[PDB]
Amino acid sequence: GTKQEKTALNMARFIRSQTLTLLEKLNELDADEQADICESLHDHADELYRSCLARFGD
Amino acid sequence: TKQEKTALNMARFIRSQTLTLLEKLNELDADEQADICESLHDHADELYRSCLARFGD
Structure with missing residues (x-):
């Protein structure tokens, strides 16, 4: 449902930002x-x- | 160093989170x-x- 889709989308987003932060480090x-x-x-x-x-972006 | 450990922990976290997300x-x-x-x-x-x-140990 919406909750599961939103959580998954949000995880994909922070994973992307964390790869950038890690690359910087x-x-x-x-x-x-x-x-x-x-x-x-x-x-x-x-x-x-x-x-x-x-x-999931609606 | 603590900065190397920060990088290491982040790499570990990305591995753990991509695993969770895969399953979800x-x-x-x-x-x-x-x-x-x-x-x-x-x-x-x-x-x-x-x-x-x-970086480990």
């Missing part, structure tokens, strides 16, 4: 390999978020 | 989204293991 730590993997992870998180918005 | 999408029968989420969780697992080797 990894870059600050000069953790280059991890930053690279995290940057791709942010692409994937964006893809999931858009997909969730399409179904 | 499965419960919604939201298959297109679940497929994307499972791949996202694969990559979150990868990032975590890389960060753990670098």
Whole structure:
């Protein structure tokens, strides 16, 4: 129902923001390999978020 | 350092949360989204293991 859809959409949103924050932290730590993997992870998180918005965004 | 541990904890959290969300999408029968989420969780697992080797202990 609406509650479950909203929770899922909200999780997809904070996951996307957390990948960006983590990428920023990894870059600050000069953790280059991890930053690279995290940057791709942010692409994937964006893809999931858009997909969730399409179904649950009302 | 505490900053490295912050990064590590965040990587672990993204792995845990993409797992939870995968299961919730499965419960919604939201298959297109679940497929994307499972791949996202694969990559979150990868990032975590890389960060753990670098920053852990």
